[PDB]
Amino acid sequence: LDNMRKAGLTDIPKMIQDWLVDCSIEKFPLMAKIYSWSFHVGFRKQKMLDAALDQLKTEYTEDVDDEMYREY
Amino acid sequence: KTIPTFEPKESILKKLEDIKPEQVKKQTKLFRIFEPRQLPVYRANGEKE
C-alpha cells in the first residue's frame, strides 16, 4: 500500500485501508472490484528483445545440493 | 551461457532375449612369472672371476 502511493494512487489505497479494519466477506466484492478494474488499463506491447531479457538471462550455479536432484 | 552438467547414475539393462554367451577363453603364450638373467660371479676372496 506504500508502493501504490508513490505511483500517485490516493483513493484506491483508501478502500483497502478501510476494509482491513473489519476483514469481512460482506464487503469483499469491493476488493474484487479493484482487482477486476485493474486489467482494463491496457496491454503491455513491447519489443521482443526487451520483453524476453529478464526471462532468458538467469544465473545457473553448481552450489545446489545434488542429494536433492537425485530424488527429483 | 553456462549450463551445469548433471550425470545421473544409470546402467544398461537388457532383456533375456539378447544376452550373448561369453567368448571361449584360449591362451596364446605360456604363463611366465620368472625369467633368467645373466649376473656376474665373485669368488671366495671377493675378487671377480
TrEMBL record, chain A:
It is found in: Virion. It comes from the Viruses. Belongs to the reoviridae RNA-directed RNA polymerase family. RNA-directed RNA polymerase that is involved in both transcription and genome replication. Together with VP3 capping enzyme, forms an enzyme complex positioned near the channels situated at each of the five-fold vertices of the core. Following infection, the outermost layer of the virus is lost, leaving a double-layered particle (DLP) made up of the core and VP6 shell. VP1 then catalyzes the transcription of fully conservative plus-strand genomic RNAs that are extruded through the DLP's channels into the cytoplasm where they function as mRNAs for translation of viral proteins. Interacts with VP3. Interacts with VP2; this interaction activates VP1. Interacts with NSP5; this interaction is probably necessary for the formation of functional virus factories. Interacts with NSP2; this interaction is weak. Interacts with VP3 (Potential). Interacts with VP2; this interaction activates VP1. Interacts with NSP5; this interaction is probably necessary for the formation of functional virus factories. Interacts with NSP2; this interaction is weak. This is RNA-directed RNA polymerase. The gene is VP1.
TrEMBL record, chain B:
Inner capsid protein that self-assembles to form an icosahedral capsid with a T=2 symmetry, which consists of 120 copies of VP2, with channels at each of its five-fold vertices. This capsid constitutes the innermost concentric layer of the viral mature particle. It encapsidates the polymerase VP1, the capping enzyme VP3 and the genomic dsRNA, thereby defining the core. Belongs to the rotavirus VP2 family. Sumoylated with SUMO1 and SUMO2. Sumoylation of viral proteins seems to have a positive role on viral replication. This is Inner capsid protein VP2. The chain holds residues 100 to 148 of 887 of the full protein. The N-terminus binds RNA. It is necessary for encapsidation of VP1 and VP3. The N-termini of 10 VP2 molecules form a cylindrical hub underneath each 5-fold axis of the inner capsid. It comes from Rotavirus A. Homodecamer; each decamer is made up of two conformers of VP2, called VP2A and VP2B. Interacts with a VP1-VP3 complex. Interacts with the intermediate capsid protein VP6. Interacts with NSP5. Interacts (via N-terminus) with NSP2. It comes from the Viruses. It is found in: Virion.
